[PDB]
């Protein structure tokens, strides 16, 4: 199951459905048959045995998120939107049975980010349907991050087509420029690695910022060059090569515009890339045999990548593959006590009214953050502590 959990998930789906049909025929709601159902699914499925000695326990309940990712990810011939919906419908029913739904929204949000920003998402219309279904489960606050991620994808799509119209009124760009503006505070991505923009891509850069100054006022742009790709062609080789590479590989290849060979130190100094990231980029470039060094007999494994080796562009590049693509991926217990203490005096309190009375009354030490207090109050009301009102507004009450 650990090696190939793909078919492990499919086993659970088939077993559950057939159990209901057999009972209603002759058993007539037998006491013994119904009782044995709740004991088998809980212990055997929710937490399996091999999660203990394999030092991997958090990943076990998280294999459901990747299953739904595979259905909405760009792949080969996929099932049509006629039989897939009904299988997803019963998935919602079993989802409420799990208690740690918070981690579900985290992993699905991170996986959705990589699917959308890289244009690897399939059936984008169906993606809105999937997120809409998750909204009904808990609320818009539960899917607050997810909805914003999908919204800015549509905004950027209309922004690019509006940018094309703006290009006709000015000098046409020598390259096709498309950009996902994304958003700050709603995405897992963040700028971490500094980068020197190549002189070829600067002008378009500036152009776009102008388009983002007239359209939007008081808005910055934190470009993520590690998440940007592009297509680069060669006009001096024997054959035309339209390679697809990230911004880092693009800059490394474009550095050979003026010369033929460079050392690692000059590459590091000119592009200001960190040692580890640049080492990984150089290694994956060497895997594609795009750049070679003087000594073929030298082994890259037992010889450290010292920042002095002179790598030269291989002018007789005749690699047998015409489809080169180097763009492949490389305990506190204080807040619960405070909550019960503040609910002692006031029998009935709103959720947000209770927040602040505990969130920031003791904020001078151990700033608690909203989600921690939400989770603690959830595990409290679960264990016969708050027993919130049956639906009248959002009062949480006490022993009522």
């Amino acid at each position: 199951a650990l090696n190939d959990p793909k078919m492990y998930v499919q086993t659970v789906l088939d077993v559950h459905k057939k159990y209901n049909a057999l009972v209603m025929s002759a058993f007539n709601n037998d006491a013994g048959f119904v009782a044995a159902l709740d004991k088998a699914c809980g212990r055997f499925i929710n937490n399996n045995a091999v999660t203990k000695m394999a030092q991997s326990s958090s990943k076990s309940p998280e294999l459901l998120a990747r299953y739904c990712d595979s259905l909405l990810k760009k792949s080969s011939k996929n099932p049509e939107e006629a039989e897939l919906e009904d299988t997803l419908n019963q998935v919602m029913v079993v989802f409420k049975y799990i208690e740690d739904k918070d981690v579900f929204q985290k992993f699905y949000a991170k996986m959705l980010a990589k699917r959308l920003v890289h244009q690897n998402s399939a059936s984008d219309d169906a993606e809105a349907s999937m997120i809409s279904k998750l909204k009904q489960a808990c609320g818009f606050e539960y899917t607050s991050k997810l909805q914003r991620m999908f919204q800015d994808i549509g905004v950027s799509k209309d922004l690019n087509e509006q940018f094309k119209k703006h290009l006709t009124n000015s000098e046409p760009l020598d390259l096709d420029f498309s950009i996902q503006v994304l958003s700050s505070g709603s995405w897992p991505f963040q700028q971490s690695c500094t980068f020197a923009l190549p002189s070829e891509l600067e002008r378009s850069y500036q152009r776009f910022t102008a388009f983002y100054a007239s359209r939007h006022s008081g808005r910055k742009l934190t470009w993520l060059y590690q998440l940007s790709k592009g297509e680069l062609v060669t006009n001096c080789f024997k054959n035309r090569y339209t390679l697809q590479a990230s911004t880092f590989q693009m800059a490394i290849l474009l550095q050979y515009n003026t010369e033929d060979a460079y050392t690692v130190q000059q590459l590091t100094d000119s592009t200001q890339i960190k040692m580890d990231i640049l080492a990984q980029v150089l290694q994956i470039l060497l895997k594609s045999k795009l750049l070679v060094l003087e000594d073929e007999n030298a082994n890259v494994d037992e010889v450290e990548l010292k920042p002095d080796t002179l790598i030269k562009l291989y002018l007789g590049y005749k690699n047998k593959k015409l489809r080169v693509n180097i763009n492949v991926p490389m305990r506190k217990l204080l807040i619960q006590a405070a909550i019960v203490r503040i609910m002692k005096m006031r029998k009935v309190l709103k959720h947000q009214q209770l927040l602040g009375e505990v969130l920031t009354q003791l904020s001078s030490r151990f700033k608690p953050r909203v989600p921690v207090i939400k989770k603690c109050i959830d595990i409290l009301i679960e264990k016969e502590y708050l027993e919130r009102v049956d639906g009248e507004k959002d009062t949480y009450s006490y022993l009522a």
Binding site: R341, K344, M345, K347
Partner: protein, 277 residues
């Protein structure tokens, strides 16, 4: 020589505690005898918090239908500090044990709150002799007279007005938790002898007495008393067609206070204004 309140008799206290005469009848305790030291320390702690709320324990014994209080010690505050400080009762050399708890209501009348009555229910259930004192600092400071709050509660699942000054906010809490406790008549005892001799320090003031500014210091208190007397008399009339005796007593005390203030004013006018005319 009277006195006889002191000299804690261990055998009598153990006998009255083992007899448990208040289990049979619920209205056993009716009189609360607070000491001079008890009041002094209680009021000092109540005013030493301003608008904030203070609470401590009060030590004493039980004699027949009366509960006598001899001492009271404050508390640091719900955390471990209060429980650690509770050991003071058995750490010092004193035979008075503990009889109840006092807590202040800075500007919220003198009644008992819902959490207050629940704590009193628990304390009475597992510690049989217990009383709650609900004195008010702001009222005694503004009006110049101490208002008492001995408010022993009823048992659970049993069924059988004075300081009604709460304008808007907490009057709702008063109405719901009103029949769950009954007030105790507070009758102060002075040990005489040493304390009666040493009470001459009150005479040392002699200026707040000569210029008391009464009848306006506690005007709101008298208006509230008349407001309570109005429906007390209406209830007496409704029953008549003995609450009338109680209404008459309340009217007599209020009128006596008013005439005492007028007498003080007349004495001051004769002493100061009618000289050098």
């Amino acid at each position: 020589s009277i006195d006889e309140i002191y000299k804690y008799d261990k055998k009598q206290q153990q006998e009255i505690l083992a007899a448990k005469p208040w289990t049979k009848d619920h209205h056993y305790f009716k009189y609360c005898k607070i000491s001079a030291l008890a009041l002094l320390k209680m009021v000092m702690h109540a005013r030493s918090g301003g608008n904030l709320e203070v609470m401590g324990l009060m030590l004493g014994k039980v004699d027949g239908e009366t509960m006598i209080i001899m001492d009271s010690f404050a508390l640091p505050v719900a955390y471990e500090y209060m429980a650690a400080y509770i050991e003071n009762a058995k750490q010092v050399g004193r035979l008075e044990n503990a009889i109840g708890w006092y807590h202040s209501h800075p500007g919220y009348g003198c009644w008992l709150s819902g959490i207050d009555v629940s704590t009193q229910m628990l304390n009475q259930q597992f510690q049989e002799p217990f009383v709650a004192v609900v004195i008010d600092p702001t009222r005694t400071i503004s009006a110049g007279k101490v208002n008492l709050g001995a408010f022993r509660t009823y048992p659970k699942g049993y069924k059988p007005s004075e300081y009604q000054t709460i304008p808007l906010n907490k009057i709702e809490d008063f109405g719901v938790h009103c029949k769950q406790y009954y007030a105790l008549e507070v009758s102060y005892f002075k040990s005489s002898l040493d304390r009666k001799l040493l009470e001459l320090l009150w005479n040392k003031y002699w200026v707040n007495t000569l210029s008391s500014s009464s009848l306006l210091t506690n005007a709101d208190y008298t208006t509230g008393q008349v407001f309570d007397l109005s429906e007390k008399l209406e209830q007496s009339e409704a029953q008549l067609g003995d609450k009338l005796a109680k209404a008459t007593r309340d009217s007599c005390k209020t009128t006596i206070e008013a005439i005492h203030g007028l007498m003080s004013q007349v004495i001051k006018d004769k002493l100061f204004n009618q000289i050098n005319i």
